[PDB]
């Protein structure tokens, strides 16, 4: 009972993780902030290289 539902939320969160990936880009030239969800940004002095 528990393992079929604990995998179901892991199926439900994975069903939400891909549908948010379709939200980010409506076109190749789409947006500079909607592409700023998957690829990350951070605080000052994170990216060393």
């Amino acid at each position: 009972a528990e393992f079929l539902s604990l995998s179901k939320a892991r199926i439900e969160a994975y069903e939400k993780e891909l549908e948010k990936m379709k939200n980010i880009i409506p076109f190749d030239q789409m947006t500079i902030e909607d592409l700023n969800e998957v690829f990350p940004e951070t605080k000052l002095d994170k990216k060393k290289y």
Binding site: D28, Q29, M30, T31, I32, L35
Partner: protein, 56 residues
């Protein structure tokens, strides 16, 4: 005595006209886009920085 060069005597003038316009003007040659894909004239300015930011 075939080819005689000439010269002209004239003052060579580094005058000082109104400068604070002339300083600001090579800022507006470079634009900055708020978009993901850009418009193929900033895109070769944006590449030219990537190079020489990887040597300093």
């Amino acid at each position: 005595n075939e080819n005689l060069f000439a010269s002209f005597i004239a003052p060579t003038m580094m005058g000082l006209p109104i400068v604070t316009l002339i300083i600001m003007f090579p800022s507006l040659l470079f634009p900055t886009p708020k978009r993901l894909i850009n418009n193929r004239t900033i895109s070769i300015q944006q590449w030219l920085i990537q190079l020489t930011s990887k040597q300093m």
